Amino acid sequence: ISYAAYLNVAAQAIRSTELQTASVLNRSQTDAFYTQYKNASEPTPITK
Amino acid sequence: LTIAEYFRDEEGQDVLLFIDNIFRFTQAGSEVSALLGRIPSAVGYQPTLATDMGLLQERITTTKKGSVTSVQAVYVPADDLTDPAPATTFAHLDATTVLSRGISELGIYPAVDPLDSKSRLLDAAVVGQEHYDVASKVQETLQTYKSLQDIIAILGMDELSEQDKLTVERARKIQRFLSQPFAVAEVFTGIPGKLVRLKDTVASFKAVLEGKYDNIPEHAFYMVGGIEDVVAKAEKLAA
Amino acid sequence: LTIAEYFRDEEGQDVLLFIDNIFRFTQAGSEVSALLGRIPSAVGYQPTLATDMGLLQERITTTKKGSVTSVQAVYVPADDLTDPAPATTFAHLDATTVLSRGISELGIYPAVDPLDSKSRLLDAAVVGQEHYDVASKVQETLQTYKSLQDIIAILGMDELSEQDKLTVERARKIQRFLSQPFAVAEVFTGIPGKLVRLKDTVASFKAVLEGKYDNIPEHAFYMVGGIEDVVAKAEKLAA
Amino acid sequence: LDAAVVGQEHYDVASKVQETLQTYKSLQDIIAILGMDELSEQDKLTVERARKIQRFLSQPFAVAEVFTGIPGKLVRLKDTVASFKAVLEGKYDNIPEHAFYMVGGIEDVVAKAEKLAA
Amino acid sequence: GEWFRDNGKHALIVYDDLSKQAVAYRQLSLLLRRPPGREAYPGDVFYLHSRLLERAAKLSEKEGSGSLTALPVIETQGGDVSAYIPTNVISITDGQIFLEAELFYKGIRPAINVGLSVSRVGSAAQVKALKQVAGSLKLFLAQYREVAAFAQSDLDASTKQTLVRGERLTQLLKQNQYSPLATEEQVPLIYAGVNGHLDGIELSRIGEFESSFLSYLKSNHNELLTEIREKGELSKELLASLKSATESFVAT
Amino acid sequence: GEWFRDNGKHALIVYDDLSKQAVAYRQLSLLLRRPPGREAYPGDVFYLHSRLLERAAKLSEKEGSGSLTALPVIETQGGDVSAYIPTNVISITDGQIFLEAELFYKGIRPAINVGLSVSRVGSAAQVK
Amino acid sequence: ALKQVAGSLKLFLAQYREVAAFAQFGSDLDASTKQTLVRGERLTQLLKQNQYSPLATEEQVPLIYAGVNGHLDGIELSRIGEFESSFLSYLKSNHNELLTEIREKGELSKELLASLKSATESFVAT
Amino acid sequence: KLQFALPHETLYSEVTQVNLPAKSGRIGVLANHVPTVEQLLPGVVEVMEGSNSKKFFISGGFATVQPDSQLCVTAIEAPLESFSENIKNLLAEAKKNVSSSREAAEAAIQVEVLENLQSV
Amino acid sequence: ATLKEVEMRLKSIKNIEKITKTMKIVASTRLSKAEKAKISAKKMDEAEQLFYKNAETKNKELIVAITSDKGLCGSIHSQLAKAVRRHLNDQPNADIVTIGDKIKMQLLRTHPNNIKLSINGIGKDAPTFQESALIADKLLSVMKAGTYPKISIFYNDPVSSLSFEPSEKPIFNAKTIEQSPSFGKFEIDTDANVPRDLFEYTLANQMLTAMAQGYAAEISARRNAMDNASKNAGDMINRYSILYNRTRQAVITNELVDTITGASS
């Protein structure tokens, strides 16, 4: 776990019923996916 | 017709009448009309289109003597459903299966346009409230999808909202679940004909609408019978 | 028309003639021609469409005795401005008055569209150089206001240049100043009616355009006659 | 326009030219509404080339001198065929469109291009 | 129908439908070899329908105050109101109730297109009680249509509110066939919708809402319904009684 | 106009406008029962105009050198220059000055559309 | 024989033009949508044909088999014309028993299919 | 002069004192502070304008006192009890039982943040 | 040509036009959200970045390209990819990580071997620290980011709402932070690796700063894009409606001629 990640956990525990607005929830949710690339083809897609 | 009328009245019993294609009746009427000294009416048809049709169709009826179940094939010129022939034909029917080209070019057979096909008997008082409701939501799901087909084009599938995406996803399945291998169509498919019972048809679609089959890929609904045939084709594809 | 004609021919009056609706005049001719066996012209109209229109319109005019001035309600088929019926009629119209739900919803009476209504006579050689110049900038101001409505709805009132934040404040006033209480509508309104002389109207607007009345609040422009009524009403809404 | 009558090379150039002109036409509407930026870099290239070919198809006529202001050009078939073949082979893409407009064969394009530099 | 109007009674006449009549009239004309025009219709086909439709009227006091009301039907082809006969009747009558296949399959039944419908008579024809609640409804839907396009994530407070009402008010106007409501049944429902008492209730339940709300009103508030039915107006007192009755029921 | 051409002087003729003339012409043709064609104009509506504008000419040395110049006016509908009558008269005249409604409303008057306007013979007659 | 090799080919091409409709959206695709887009584009090219040059069924059957069964999917599109007359030339010499079997039996036994499967794969690497 | 900033909202960007949960322990950065860089643990931050002070709870981040006496506090999340007991408890028991269920790395770090916030 | 044809083409555009304009107001709305993300990240950009100026920090290379997954936004992805390409000559042996598919597509057409990781499904909501930090966590792990002597972030810089500016900025590793000229201007506790933390925090942060500006730049481009789309879409509608009316009128005349010809005999 990287220092940024470490800080996310703390930051998103500082989140995880009101004061918990829309953009607050939607900072605790990421739609992102990573896909590794080589030679290009890939190493099959996975959630972040 | 005169033959089938005798069976209706003098054998006093159920007769089926199959007519392919009733359009040719009106068209043939057209072909002589100009020579019979008639000023042609709109789109070049005879001035007597509708009343000619009346005198014909009104004879093809069930009466207090006996029963006629007629099935008529109706050609629709240039695909235009407002051409006065199919246009005037509609009001004469109790149930109307409208086959569409759009549908057939997606490889859905039979190409029945699910929104435009109508029946006097789709009524809670006839099919029961459940049968009715399933049909209704089915129609709504598909129409929602139809409306949303232009946002699909410009802004991609991704730009849809929460419940809409799911509905659109449920539509695509339902759309394919309405396709069916006909026995007479076997040389066009290679697939054996399937005949589905009405109570299953309701049961199946009701279930799909409740999302009990959303983890099943699209190709499993296409050209199959009841619900069990989907479950079974989804394991043949998983294999 | 003939009734109006005699007031010009025998009393030498400036008569008004109202035709509601001129389109029904054209369709009626269309119908009669058809009935008389004449081969219909383009888009089904009579072949005599233009001379028929002439034979009416050319009788409406200034002579040396007086004038018949006709206000004719115009309906546009299919909203196709180029349909023979309007196309022919528009060849005789000296001007337009457009009453628009888009104006009456903002509470402006009469509901004239200040930009859609146009005149052939709005020209220096007909109205004088002054009259034209007031009207012109009155028209140019309301346009700049119209194209600034969209940024006011999303950004904010403060996102404008020195001269443009003044001219929206100016138009907003001009706009309310174009409304007028009518004399005949008093039975329904209770507000006594103003008949505003032309010289008044030119001078009244000329004075605002130079910016003599930016100190005046907006409500002093609503339902008033001359500029002397703006001076008067503003003092009531204070003291 | 048959590979036997005009020879395979002439035919092939003519076909590839028409293809390119057709792609652009197939896109006129997307280009018109959404503009060049919405196209795949493949199409972006085929369009940009089509736009050159189109201009290159123009020609100052001797009889039309009073309207072009430029003296007429007559271009020879073999010189025409070799010129377009070369534009297809992406050897002139780094050149401005206007250079292709209202000239003769390829040698005038380079000429107009070098002149319009200054 | 004119027998009634002429003897101080009131008739309603439904011509189902004048498309098919026009077609018949055309048949005779073409066969009698009368000059044909647009779509082969005779030059007097407008006069066929105006002659007819002008016979609906409300008579004066002197004349017994009788009345005939006409609901002609016209069948259009793929929505084309510019077709010859649709144009004739549309310009002859006092307004259109305009129906659509789209709205139909969407679920909106009756499939009335509010945008393209009107009564030119308007309010003078409407029970005051309804007019009072329906004044706004005309709007809350008009703006809903101008903004309906936005129902596809980043929507500010003002524009989302209008989306909530519109949805609900549209659902309120959904109606089962052969099930007309009484005016005193109608205004409560529209009162609830219009003023925002439905905004809370989730969309799939506005059906059962209308259903129970009326039966709860009959059980416990029969008096207000009766006052609406009999006096047709809403007094300031009634609005308050209605405001209370509604919030009361909404809470459960 | 021709008297001046025929006698050695120069006359200018303005037809305001031919559109309305062709409309007047179709009326007679229809009332005469001549088959309607495109836009219900008779087959010879082109001939109507062509025989007219052909009379605008510049005469040789041997004929006094008289000139008739024609400026026909045509009215388009919604700027459509593709209509039957417009293209007919375009195909008879030696060019056209096209006036764009878009420029005219903007204030640009004369509202000449440059691309769409051409004189076909003028250059060789325009003052050097 | 031709019916066999053209299994779902007409519908397959419909799936292709449905797929290539979604490509215009400037969209990147997955394993299912790129794989089919690629093959259809090659099948299209395979159906291009010069005038006055009709083919024999024994010549047609192989090419379609080579198209529908994946054997063209990794060949440059400008080279599909040259693949034709080269694959034909190759079968005429080396596998002339294969063609005679098709021109005379008009069908494909499991043995012919396996014999063809191998004969194609062989030619892919020249 | 103070520059306090979150990524979503920037709070300060003229102050007499600030108190930070730095590297090891709480600090108080006065008007003239020796330039320093310290990680901020997830804790409570206080800003002074005389004796005027608004506390903030913080995700953690970095503080730097500059050569020109400027402070730069940067964290992800920042009011205290007016913003963020049972709300935190239904997440704190979910962590102790998540250590025995790798995934156990992040779930165990959540507990050191919980019982720290619980002391406020 | 035929009324039925012209009816559908006119009605098709009538939708595209209402579409693009709905997406032009959806953009304008999302722009208030945009400056609350730009400004709030440009201020965290003065403060975070200032340490490095004073400490005077300077420096196989790792390129991180940032745009999005969504088109219809002018030349956002086109010219950013052009800035990366221009830079890529001066060192073709770079390793590329792509944030956004549209930019991945661009660089995959030109430098496919250089791309080693692609971050997906981005353009939707505004960029958050979680995405920022979890991408960072992937770079450190899968790309082994900490070992490159050079790391670069390419992103679009919104100068205004009318045009943008393809930009670049460096991310310094632990080694480089430590060894900087004025690193000993600060009383840094020499103990538990602060340069390590300061690097891995700045790796997430300056990515977010970049995304947050690129976002803003895109929304303001998409708006201007839709604005002209709607302008052209609407201008086409006028020309087609005009064509419609001609073709409508022509259909009435021609049917009327057939009927008149038929009665003539």
CATH (domain of E200): 1.20.150.20
**C-beta atoms of I105 and G25 within 8 A:** no
Residue whose tokens read 């049944």: E185
Q: Which residue has the tokens 């129906």?
A: E99
d(CA C23, CA C25): 5
In chain G, how long is the greatest CA-to-CA distance?
49
Based on the number of CB atoms within 10 Å of its own CB, is E130 exposed (0-12), middle (13-18) or buried (19 or more)? Answer: buried
Q: Which residues pair with E175 in a beta bridge?
A: none
- Count CB-CB contacts under 10 A for residue H67: 12
User: Distance between CA H41 and CA A1 in Å, rounded?
Assistant: 16
Distances in Å between the Cα of G61 and the Cα atoms of B121, C120, I262 are 51, 77, 56
Contacts of C87 in chain F (CB under 8 A): 77
Q: Helix D41-56 vs helix D8-34: angle between axes, to the nearest 10 degrees?
A: 120
Tell me which residues of chain C have a C-beta less than 8 Å from any C-beta of chain F. 38-42, 47-48, 50-51, 81-82, 87
The residue segments making up the domain with residue I51 are 26-225
Residue C46: HSE in the Cβ half-sphere, 13 Å Cα cutoff? 21
Q: Looking at beta carbons, which residues of chain C come within 8 Å of I242? A: 82
Which is nearest to I211 in space by CA: I144, I135, I110, I106? I135
Whole-angstrom distance, CA of residue E36 vs CA of residue C37: 8
Length reported for chain F:
128
Distance CA A17, CA A29 (A): 16
Partner-chain contact F80 I257, CB within 8 Å:
no
DSSP label at residue H75:
E
CATH of the domain at B143: 1.10.1140.10
I160 touches chain C (CB under 8 A): no
Q: How far apart are CA C208 and CA E120, in angstroms?
A: 40
What DSSP string runs through B36-57? TTPPP-GGG--TTHHHHHHHHH
I191 DSSP 8-state letter: S
Closest CA to I64 of I12, I140, I1: I140
- Burial tier of E46 (Cβ tally within 10 Å: 0-12, 13-18, 19+): buried
Ordered by start, the domain boundaries in chain A are 1-48
**CATH 2.60.15.10 holds for H1-84:** yes
Dihedral sign, Cα of residue B61, residue B63, residue B65, residue B67 = positive
Residues G9/G68, Cβ–Cβ less than 8 Å: yes
Sort strands H44-49 and A33-36 into parallel, antiparallel or unpaired: unpaired
Burial G81-95 (b: 16+ CB within 10 A, else e): eebbeebbebbeeeb
Distance (Å) from the alpha carbon of I25 to chain E's nearest alpha carbon: 9
I19/B151 Cβ within 8 A: yes
- Full domain range(s) for residue C136: 122-239
- Distance, CA of G75 to chain centre: 12
Active-site residue flag, F120: yes
Tokens matching residue B121: 């008997």
Residues with Cβ within 8 Å of A48's Cβ and at least 6 positions away in sequence, in order, are: A30, A32, A33, A34, I119, I131, I134, I135, I138
Domain count, chain D: 1
The residues with which I118 forms a beta bridge, in sequence order, are A35, I98
Note the resolution in Å, 1 decimal.
Answer: 3.2
Q: Which of B159, B141, B24 is nearest to B85 (CA)?
A: B24
Domain range holding G48? 1-126
Chain F CB contacts of D67 under 8 Å are 118
- CB of G78 within 8 Å of a chain D CB? The answer is no
Give E239's contacts (C-beta < 8 A, 6+ positions apart). none
Cβ atoms of G88 and G59 within 8 Å: the answer is yes
The rounded distance, in Å, linking the Cα atoms of G16 and G44 is 10
With touching defined as 3 or more inter-chain CB pairs under 8 Å, the answer for chains C and I is yes
Domain span at residue E223 reads 127-252
- What are residue B51's phi and psi, to 5 degrees? -70, -30
Chains B and G touch (3+ CB pairs under 8 A): yes
At least 3 CB pairs under 8 A between chains I and H: yes
I238 and I221, same domain (yes or no) = no
List subunits contacting chain E, requiring 3 or more Cβ pairs under 8 Å: B, C, I
Q: What is the rounded distance in angstroms from the CA atom of residue E39 to the CA atom of residue F90?
A: 34
> Structurally, how many domains does chain G consist of?
1
D44: closest CA among E28, F70, I79, H34?
A: I79
Tell me which residue of C214, C180, C220, C172 sits closest to C196, measured CA to CA.
Answer: C180
Q: What is the CA radius of gyration of chain F?
A: 17
Angle, helices E222-231/E206-220, rounded to nearest 10 degrees: 90
DSSP character for F40?
G
User: Rounded to whole angstroms, how far apart are CA atoms F13 and F69?
Assistant: 6
* Contact yes or no for C148/C166 (Cβ under 8 A): no
Domains of chain I: total:
2
- Cα radius of gyration rounded to whole Å, chain C: 22
CA–CA dist I220, I38 (Å, integer) = 12
Across-strand partners of C43? none
Name the nearest CA neighbour of E43 among C34, C26, C23, I253: C34
The torsion angle over the Cα atoms of residues G102, G103, G106 and G112, rounded to 10 degrees, is -10
Shortest CA distance from G25: residue in chain I? I71
Which architecture characterizes domain A1-48 according to CATH?
A: Orthogonal Bundle (1.10)
Residue with tokens 């200018």: F12
Q: Which candidate, E129, E110, E133, E12, places its Cα nearest to that of E68?
A: E12
- In three-state secondary structure terms, B212 is coil
Question: How many angstroms separate the CA atoms of G72 and G43, rounded?
Answer: 8
Q: What is the CA radius of gyration of chain I?
A: 27
C-alpha E240: how far from chain center: 27
Q: CB-based contacts of I60: which residues, under 8 Å, 6+ apart?
A: I93, I95, I148, I149, I150
I115-120 and H17-21: which strand pairing?
unpaired
**Which residues sit opposite H72 in a β-bridge?**
H3, H64
DSSP C112: B
| Residue F58 bridge partners (DSSP) | F67
- Amino acid D11 reads Y
With beta carbons under 8 A apart, name residues in chain B contacting E101.
115-116
Suggest the residue from A1, A9, A20 to mutate for an interface test with chain H (most H CBs closer than 10 A). A9
HSE value, Cβ hemisphere, 13 Å, CA-based, for E50? 10
Q: Is the omega angle on the peptide bond into residue B110 within 30 degrees of 0, that is, cis?
A: yes
Residue with tokens 């992406």: D90
Provide φ and ψ at B118, rounded to 5°. -140, 155
As to burial, measured by CB atoms within 10 angstroms (0-12 exposed, 13-18 middle, 19+ buried), residue E59 is middle
Which residues of H are less than 8 Å from A7 in CB distance? 42, 59-61, 75-76
Of chain D, the end-to-end C-alpha distance in Å amounts to 41
Cα–chain center distance at B200: 19
- Whether C219 and C230 have beta carbons less than 8 Å apart is answered as no
- DSSP single-letter state for residue H54: E
Q: Which residue in the block uniquely carries the two structure tokens 């001046």?
A: F4
Q: Judge whether C214 and C170 are in contact, CB under 8 Å.
A: yes
The answer to whether E86 touches E76, Cβ cutoff 8 Å, is yes
* Lookup: tokens for A10: 């703390």
Q: Is the peptide bond before I254 cis (omega within 30 degrees of 0)?
A: no
Separation of alpha carbons E210 and F66, rounded Å? 90
CA distances from C23 to B64, C74, D64 (A): 54, 6, 50
